[PDB]
């Protein structure tokens, strides 16, 4: 007799079989099998294909459980109150933990809002990623955690999540920055976003822009703006204040950016008011 006690080595989510990057504390028994089923709508986990199918045939909505506060021809965003959808958000946090070195206790979702992004096509809604945000952040962080599901990574979705998070801050008349410390993947994504943002502003808005105009237009913090401007070598002093300025490098980067034909968030489609 060899009794095998296996780790969760693959999660089955729709047609995808995904390998976890890190341990996540799913409250399930460890056995000789190394898989679980994750319903791609409810995010519920099942040790058994039969149990999973039994619940799959139930009538459920085929998108995340919150208000659709943004909808364009490409994506929707749903705003979910952790306290109002405890089970679903707990399920989302267990799933997210498989791809994070650390995450706050998955069970305690009440303090968070979750902004969940779906792709819509002939088959309906497909959750591709989300960011959470503290209802009340002492440090003014505008994102707590952010995640694109591995099967959808490196398709541009992460950047859309980040862009959306700043559209909320702008509507709030606040600057914001993601919670630190940031994973390496998170930080590199933010740096690319910050860089594309300044580059786009310089070409489409104004050849020279003060740090405070940038902040007003983007909701980026002074610190993130300065760090990014220094990396791009575009920090100067002009008419008595610090600015960023356009040069041939920036223009070239912009053209390479446009050439990629990437989707962006349309602020006019965000139908949302801060809690006030
Ligand atoms: C951080 C994270 C959300 C980024 O998500 P993502 O959707 O992969 O991000 P994007 O696709 O917008 O950009 C990532 C890369 O893919 C590339 N990419 C995007 N679209 C592409 C396309 N159509 N073809 C080729 N490459 C593409 C980008 O250029 C970028 O490449 P680079 O890093 O070499 O510059 C993701 O890595 C993740 O969920 N990580 C684990 C969770 C985590 O660590 N979160 C941190 C907060 S707690």
From Swiss-Prot:
The record marks 145 as: Important for catalytic activity. Changing residue 88 to A: Strongly reduces HAT activity. Residues 3-274 form the MYST-type HAT domain. The active site is at 179 (proton donor/acceptor). Changing residue 92 to A: Strongly reduces HAT activity. Acetyl-CoA binds at residues 144-148, 153-159, 183. The modification N6-acetyllysine is found at residue 103. Keywords: Acetylation, Activator, Chromatin regulator, DNA damage, DNA repair, Phosphoprotein, Transcription, Transcription regulation, Transferase. One of its GO terms (cellular component) is chromatin. The keyword Isomerase does not apply. Changing residue 91 to A: Strongly reduces HAT activity. Changing residue 100 to A: Strongly reduces HAT activity. Autoacetylation at Lys-103 is required for proper function. Present with 1170 molecules/cell in log phase SD medium. Component of the NuA4 histone acetyltransferase complex composed of at least ACT1, ARP4, EAF3, EAF5, EAF6, EAF7, EPL1, ESA1, SWC4, TRA1, VID21, YAF9 and YNG2. The complex interacts with histones H4 (HHF1 and HHF2), H3 (HHT1 and HHT2) and H2A (HTA1 and HTA2). This is Histone acetyltransferase ESA1. The chain holds residues 160 to 435 of 445 of the full protein.
């Amino acid at each position: 007799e060899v009794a095998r006690v296996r780790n969760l080595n693959r999660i089955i989510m729709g047609k995808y079989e995904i390998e976890p990057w890190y341990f996540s504390p799913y409250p399930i028994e460890l056995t000789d099998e190394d898989f679980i089923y994750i319903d791609d709508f409810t995010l519920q986990y099942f040790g058994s294909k039969k149990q999973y199918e039994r619940y799959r045939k139930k009538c459920t909505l085929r998108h995340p459980p919150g208000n659709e506060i943004y909808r364009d021809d490409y994506v929707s965003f749903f705003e979910i109150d952790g306290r109002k959808q405890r089970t679903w958000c707990r399920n989302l946090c267990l799933l997210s933990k498989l791809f994070l070195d650390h995450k706050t206790l998955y069970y305690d979702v009440d303090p968070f809002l979750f902004y969940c992004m779906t792709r819509r096509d002939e088959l309906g809604h497909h959750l591709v990623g989300y960011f959470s945000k503290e209802k009340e952040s002492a440090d003014g962080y505008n994102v707590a955690c952010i995640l694109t599901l591995p099967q959808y990574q490196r398709m541009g979705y992460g950047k859309l999540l980040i862009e959306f998070s700043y559209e909320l801050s702008k509507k709030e008349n606040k600057v914001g920055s993601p919670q630190k410390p940031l994973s390496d993947l998170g930080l590199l994504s933010y740096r690319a976003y910050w860089s594309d943002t300044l580059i786009t502003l310089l070409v489409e808005h104004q050849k020279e822009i003060t740090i405070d105009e940038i902040s007003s237009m983007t909701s980026m913090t002074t610190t993130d703006i300065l760090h990014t401007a220094k990396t791009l070598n575009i920090l100067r002093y002009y008419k008595g204040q610090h600015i960023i300025f356009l040069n041939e490098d920036i223009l070239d980067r912009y053209n390479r950016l446009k050439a990629k034909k990437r989707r962006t968030i349309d602020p006019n489609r965000l139908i949302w008011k801060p809690p006030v």
